[PDB]
Design a protein around this nucleic acid. Sequence first.
RNA 1: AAUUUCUACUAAGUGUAGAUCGCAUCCAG
DNA 2: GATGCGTAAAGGACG
DNA 3: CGTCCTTTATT
Length: 1202
Amino acid sequence: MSKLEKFTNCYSLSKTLRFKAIPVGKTQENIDNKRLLVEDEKRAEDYKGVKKLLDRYYLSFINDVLHSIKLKNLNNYISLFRKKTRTEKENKELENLEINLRKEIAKAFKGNEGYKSLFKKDIIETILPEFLDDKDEIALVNSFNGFTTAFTGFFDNRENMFSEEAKSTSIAFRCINENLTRYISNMDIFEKVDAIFDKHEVQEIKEKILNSDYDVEDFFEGEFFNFVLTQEGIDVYNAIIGGFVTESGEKIKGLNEYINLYNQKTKQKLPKFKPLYKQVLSDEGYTSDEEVLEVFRNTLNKNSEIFSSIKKLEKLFKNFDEYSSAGIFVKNGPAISTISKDIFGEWNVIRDKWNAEYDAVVTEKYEDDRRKSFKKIGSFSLEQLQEYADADLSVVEKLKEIIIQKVDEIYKVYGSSEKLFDADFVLEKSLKKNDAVVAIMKDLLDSVKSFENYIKAFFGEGKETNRDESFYGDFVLAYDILLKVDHIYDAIRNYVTQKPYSKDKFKLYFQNPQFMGGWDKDKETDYRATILRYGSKYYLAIMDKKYAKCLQKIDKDDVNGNYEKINYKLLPGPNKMLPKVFFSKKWMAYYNPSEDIQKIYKNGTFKKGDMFNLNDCHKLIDFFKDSISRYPKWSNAYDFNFSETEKYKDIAGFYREVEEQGYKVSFESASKKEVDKLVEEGKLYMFQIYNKDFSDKSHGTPNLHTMYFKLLFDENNHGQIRLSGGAELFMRRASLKKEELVVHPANSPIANKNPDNPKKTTTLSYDVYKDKRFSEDQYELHIPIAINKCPKNIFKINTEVRVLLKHDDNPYVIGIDRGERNLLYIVVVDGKGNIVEQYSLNEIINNFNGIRIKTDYHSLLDKKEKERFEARQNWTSIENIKELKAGYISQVVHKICELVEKYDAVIALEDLNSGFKNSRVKVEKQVYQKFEKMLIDKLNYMVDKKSNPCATGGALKGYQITNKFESFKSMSTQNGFIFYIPAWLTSKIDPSTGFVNLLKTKYTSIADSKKFISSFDRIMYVPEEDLFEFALDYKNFSRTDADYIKKWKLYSYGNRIRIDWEEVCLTSAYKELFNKYGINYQQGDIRALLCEQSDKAFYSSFMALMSLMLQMRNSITGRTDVDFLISPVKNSDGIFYDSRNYEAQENAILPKNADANGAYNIARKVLWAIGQFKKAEDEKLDKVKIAISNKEWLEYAQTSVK
RNA sequence: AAUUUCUACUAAGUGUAGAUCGCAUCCAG
DNA sequence: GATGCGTAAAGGACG
DNA sequence: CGTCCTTTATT
Ligand SMILES: [Mg+2]
């Protein structure tokens, strides 16, 4: 009984192994003499070029078929599509009509005589040359005759366009699912808004755009949709909506622009047409320091157009008073928060302005509408913002001083960068080496980008009642120029952030278009590549084109050393392969197939479905079985032991056996003398398949992929991992010069970087060079493999994880959370919520032999954040921080893998599509999404390297506890052993009571504060405890529906940390407040006394003191010692939860800090979810809904504690 | 600071620890 | 964010 | 013929 070990051999997946390929002997000389590499580097260039020419015919071919087409179901489909109350029967009716529509488009493509020719040899040899009209391009297409086979991959990418399936690549899909659905939506919008388009306005568009061939109304009739399948037709339809610019250039207004004016001018909100997506085939980074510089000078010197639009916007905003503040608008969004701070000094007073009119009891159903309606608003006028502005304060004037300040900052930064615009300037050093120059460009780009990004707010996305077009004329003219800095900024950064070395490479064919296509022995002459082994070393051997058979003649040498030559036989896709060989002209003549058999095949009765007859399919199997016996190329290669025919449920049952039997890998001896002579003579090319684990000096644990590779040829491996075909060989030219490599000279001691390492310095007897692998040309060999090619343990993973979780008595849960003080923090929890392990993942502990050395990745990040501060916020420091986090999570994955194996444990993770990230966490959402993906990816085939490969958990019996990754949005609910959970109320919660603070202690008014105090059931001093007790029922406050216990007694117990910062003792601070105002707090119930007080400074200190008492999380930024969590509520035994009572202990039963509390409580929501499983029937476990609500959570957190 | 490749390394001396699905194509803001 | 290949053996063109 | 390139068959 182990949950983990029921998840092996569940599904097949493909992986690629990568290696360095080191030439052996005369191989590199022979390759150099034959000029093979130069051929392939050129071929790659021409191959990329021919693909674009090939596109042109494909594109032209699409227009011919799409123009001719006429869709049959159109009117019937659109109607059914529009019904808003469809029976489930009618929804399937729509799907059939939708499938038929796509099938009409696909069959129109594939029904041509021409369609088959496009992806055959013929397109390059004959069709394309006649199509082209340029002598040079025809020569290029001509260079690839006899090399058509190498285009297959491209051909497949184009075959996807003509599919009838509902797939992103398809033409039919773009027409029917996306463009039709949009067209229908535009028909709906058109009839509502039809009238507002002026009689004159339409007749324009018909002459100016339509050219008088069609009426604008036609484009919104359903039967007219055929015109818009082509890119030409789409351009016209989108032109009507967007507006057109003639050959003369006269601006022609679009229907969507008309609607804008109308809704604007009348302060209404009618809808606007969606434009149609492009057709599927209709129509790069800076490469050098000289190019990067050239753009910086050209676009940002003092007489560039961007600098011209800055001077115009300075003149425009200098005249800000001259314009109408009622017709100047600020877009609603982040820019409202910023501009609110800019002039008042306060983010949320402009919030209060609109709140002042809109603002007293708050049901959250009213609160959402209260909150939702303000979000609905598109923008605010300067007049509305001045309606906010208290008297004596001018919103326009101090906006002017802020904008003008930003342009003066640009001009000062220009003077500091001025020598970077001299025509005389030349670059002394490379930019990445040249921190000074990169800092100069960054400073100028930033000051302009910030000015651009700030000024962008003055839009109002209008859609806006009468706008000051005198202001928005000059403004729009200049801003459209200024917006060019966005593209410039991104490109220059992406260049500075790049690595110094280049991974550019080109594929090697050795003059074979199907080079190294597969490893099968029979095909080894055709492919001219194979695999040799000598002891521990492996080699890729390549026969030269003039001597393809040279390896086949070699025989074993008894006396001398021998290579091990691979003997690889595969029967790939028997369902594909078995018929073609047995129904081929060559074999059909040999073997008389009864008319029943060719019937069954032509009829399709063997295939599962309504046409299926078990006997018919059985008969076909026996046909295949006898023919395999008659076909000795297969029967002799594979020891076929088929199950008795009667047992087969379907044809796939027979095929599955064939597929699993049809694989065999062994080795044959081959004279090492004879083979080596072949290499010397130039007839054979030999590379060692190499990574650092194959080094003579290598010792200790190898790479996981080193194990997969060696296991391919291990006889303890039995199809668990298959060696796949389609391997590719590349050449990556060096991108660094050996002289320009950083060297640590031999016999001089090198300073070690890790603080925790005891050894501070290392001295070697040899030189070591940074990035040495890129100072030389390097072959790399990519090898695909197939794991669990024939899976036996077929079940839906999630349903199985749910069944085991239900019946498992003590389920273990691994809760992972992101902390402010901790990169990641782990809590392991048993089936009843008891903490089993809790610790931070700030330090990764690496194990080699018995030695342990830790790496504090949190200290690493801190040192790199400090390095970011120094040298401003340099472009690279951000990258270095990004990659360090990306390499950190690759360490964390292994730690999670151990815990999962150790505790047979289910993982609990945050749902990142619902929760909101505080940004106090170090690991931002973008890095965590990466992590949760890697997690999923590892758990498709979870393996412990140090385990023996044949054991479950080992490299041949990997755990499959997770389904293949789909999308970040799919990282929700559950993926096998991984559960995704909202982070809500997981940190600011008392773990010993489930208590949470649902009160709003923000001070608004004296009257608001009185109603707050009166809503408590009692407020009294407790002499026998020296505490103030606040009995409350949450029913008497608003937005308290989620809480379950409702009745709580708060206490002013212990200290809090007010935020600089000060420590506040709650009990004495209440006494201090009450004594300041003469309140007798010892006189039983005090509630009357506090409300009697008439001073506003009293209620503000009181609400502030309530805020602190209900502030359960207390921290000092920069003081990692102080992150304590303290509860104002007693538990069953009258104890207050204080996290510091447990951070002292080594094994604590409750969370040790706020960060541990989060991981603890993320894990507990899975426990609730397991509780939901144990409630349901085994059959309906699929139906159980995992997502926990804030109401369900608070009930579980407050009842399960006991 | 060496790497199939990435990060952290130097890990006891040409390397350590973990991770690593390649290749082509299309569509998106 | 999705597509598709990870192939041996039939089949044919060219000397 | 051979040899090299092409085309093919799909639960
Ligand atoms: Mg190692």
